[PDB]
């Protein structure tokens, strides 16, 4: 249950999420694109899912990829802001899931985002403790896929 997954977000976990987000979320365009480019670099098999974005090897220059990356970051902004109210977190996550389910993105495939997140966090000096916190947020979405 998505609700059961949201239970893993204890006070300490929510604290690390907000603290780290104040930094990585402060530069959505730069960090969002870093996330996507890292995803494609370490998981080439996922490139096929994003054919609508054109040539993703163009990075920042690709306007479609840039728009997707910035938008992706606002979905994370949404999750972070609903952390204190499980009911709101759950309804936003379930809607979010709808389109990813239609695209046939399994819970395991979605989990591939953990790698890129860990690296982006590391680039800002946020270690394993923070990566584990983020993996728990991602697990909430996985519970809905």
Task: Name the minimum Å distance from CB 15 to its own copies.
Answer: 22
145 in contact with its own copies (CB under 8 A): no
Task: Name the minimum Å distance from CB 67 to its own copies.
Answer: 3
Contacting residues toward ligand HEM, per CB under 6 A: 46, 49-50, 52, 68, 71-72, 75-76, 95, 98-100, 103, 105, 109-110, 112-113
What's the 3-state SS for 110-136?
HHHHHHHHHHHHHHCCCCHHHHHHHHH
Query: Which run of H or of E encompasses 71?
Result: helix 63-81
The answer to whether the annotation marks 68 as part of a ligand binding site is no
Task: Name the minimum Å distance from CB 69 to its own copies.
Answer: 9
1 vs 4: CA distance, rounded Å:
5
- Within 57-76, the residues that bind its own copies by CB under 8 A are 63-64, 66-68, 70-71, 74-75
12 vs 22: CA distance, rounded Å:
16
Q: Per the structure block, which two tokens stand in for 11?
A: 């006070």
Q: Count of CB atoms within 10 A of residue 34's CB? A: 19
Out of ligand HEM, its own copies, none, which partner does residue 47 contact, by CB within 5 to 8 A per kind?
none
């Amino acid at each position: 249950s998505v609700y059961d997954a949201a239970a893993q977000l204890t006070a300490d976990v929510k604290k690390d999420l907000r603290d780290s987000w104040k930094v990585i979320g402060s530069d959505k365009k730069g960090n969002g694109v870093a996330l996507m480019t890292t995803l494609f670099a370490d998981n080439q098999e996922t490139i096929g899912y994003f054919k609508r974005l054109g040539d993703v090897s163009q990075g920042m220059a690709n306007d479609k990829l840039r728009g997707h990356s910035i938008t992706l970051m606002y979905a994370l902004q949404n999750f972070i802001d609903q952390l204190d109210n499980p009911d709101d977190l759950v309804c936003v996550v379930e809607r979010f899931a709808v389109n990813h389910i239609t695209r046939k993105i399994s819970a395991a495939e979605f989990g591939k985002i953990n790698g890129p997140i860990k690296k982006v966090l590391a680039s800002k000096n946020f270690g394993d403790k923070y990566a584990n916190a983020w993996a728990k947020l991602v697990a909430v979405v996985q519970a809905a896929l």
